[PDB]
Every structure is written in C-alpha cells, then in structure tokens.
Amino acid sequence: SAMEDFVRQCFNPMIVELAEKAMKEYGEDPKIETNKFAAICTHLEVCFMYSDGGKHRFEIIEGRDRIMAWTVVNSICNTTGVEKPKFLPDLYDYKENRFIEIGVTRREVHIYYLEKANKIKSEKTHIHIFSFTGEEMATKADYTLDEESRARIKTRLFTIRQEMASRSLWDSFRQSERGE
Ligand SMILES: NC(=O)c1[nH]c(Br)cc(=O)c1O
Ligand SMILES: [Mn+2]
Ligand SMILES: [Mn+2]
Numbered sequence: 001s002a003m004e005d006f007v008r009q010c011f012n013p014m015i016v017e018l019a020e021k022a023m024k025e026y027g028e029d030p031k032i033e034t035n036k037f038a039a040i041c042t043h044l045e046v047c048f049m050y051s052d053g054g055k056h057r058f059e060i061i062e063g064r065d066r067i068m069a070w071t072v073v074n075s076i077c078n079t080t081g082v083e084k085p086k087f088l089p090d091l092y093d094y095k096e097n098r099f100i101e102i103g104v105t106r107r108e109v110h111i112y113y114l115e116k117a118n119k120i121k122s123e124k125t126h127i128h129i130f131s132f133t134g135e136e137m138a139t140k141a142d143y144t145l146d147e148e149s150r151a152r153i154k155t156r157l158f159t160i161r162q163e164m165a166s167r168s169l170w171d172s173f174r175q176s177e178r179g180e
Pocket of ligand 2: 062088089
C-alpha cells in the first residue's frame, strides 16, 4: 500500500533491507505492520547518521545481527572495562566511553525518555531521544553531538514526517506506538 511505497521511496535500499530483516526477527509482515516498518527504517537511519556525525568516534551496534552485536559489545567491554549492558544498545561512544541508546518518538520526548530510562535501568548507558518536532532530551542534558549534527538529524526526521503528511500517512503513524 501507500506506506510500503513511501518507505521504499524515502529510505535507501540498505536501510530497507535491514528493516525487513528486523521484521522477520519480530515475525511481522512489513506489508501489514506498515507503521512499525517505517519506524524501524527511521530509527535505523538516525543511528547511522548519529555515528556518521562522529578517527571514528562511534561504533554502530544497531543494525547488526544479534551475534555480531553481542560480539562487538563484549569486545568493547573487554578492552574498556565499561559495564556490560543488559539490553543491546545502539552505539558506543569512544570519546565519552559510554554506550548510547537512541530513541525516536512520535510522543513527547520526556514521556519516551522516562519509558526508556525505566526499561534499561542502568545509570551508565546514555539515552538520547529525538522527536519529529525538533525536540530532544538526553541523559543529564548531555547531547553528545555538536549542534550541526543534531540539526541534521532533526531536519531529516521532520522531513520524513512532512513526506508522510503529504501522503496522508502521518496521522496513522503518529497515533501508533508501534516501533517505539
Ligand atoms: N530492538 C532495539 O534495539 C530497539 N527496539 C525499539 Br521498539 C526501539 C529502539 O530505540 C531500539 O534501539
Ligand atoms: Mn537498538
Ligand atoms: Mn534505540
């Protein structure tokens, strides 16, 4: 339908393939769970732009299969002594030496921040929440990146929102929590 066409049009093939493998990991059909499909693509794209903004400052953990994700996490923990996370995070920051969980939400950033912080329940994993409204919220108000990079992420998310809006897809997507 329209959501599947949109996702194939605004995301590059690499992200779309990773998103479809996420959907088979979950057991869900991208033709049917189209909001979750789009949310997964959007979150992948943000994680990849975040680590590109970073001499490579960030290690990408999201988007790897689980074997390779835990391999990377364990290697980081073995060479830094940073405490192992209970859930797979999204990136590792080699400058601040901490794991990062990235959240992308259609709700208020502080609501989703509280939800993430309550879930992962580790003071050491840094949380950074982005909305589709240019808002952000991060552990200790430490936004990690400089203003330019955060601006580029915010711009991309708002653009995705407006592209769905032009296709009459935004109302469905925002009223859904699927993919968060
Ligand atoms: N499986 C994950 O790693 C994951 N899942 C959801 Br739902 C939202 C996230 O931000 C995230 O990193
Ligand atoms: Mn993740
Ligand atoms: Mn995340």
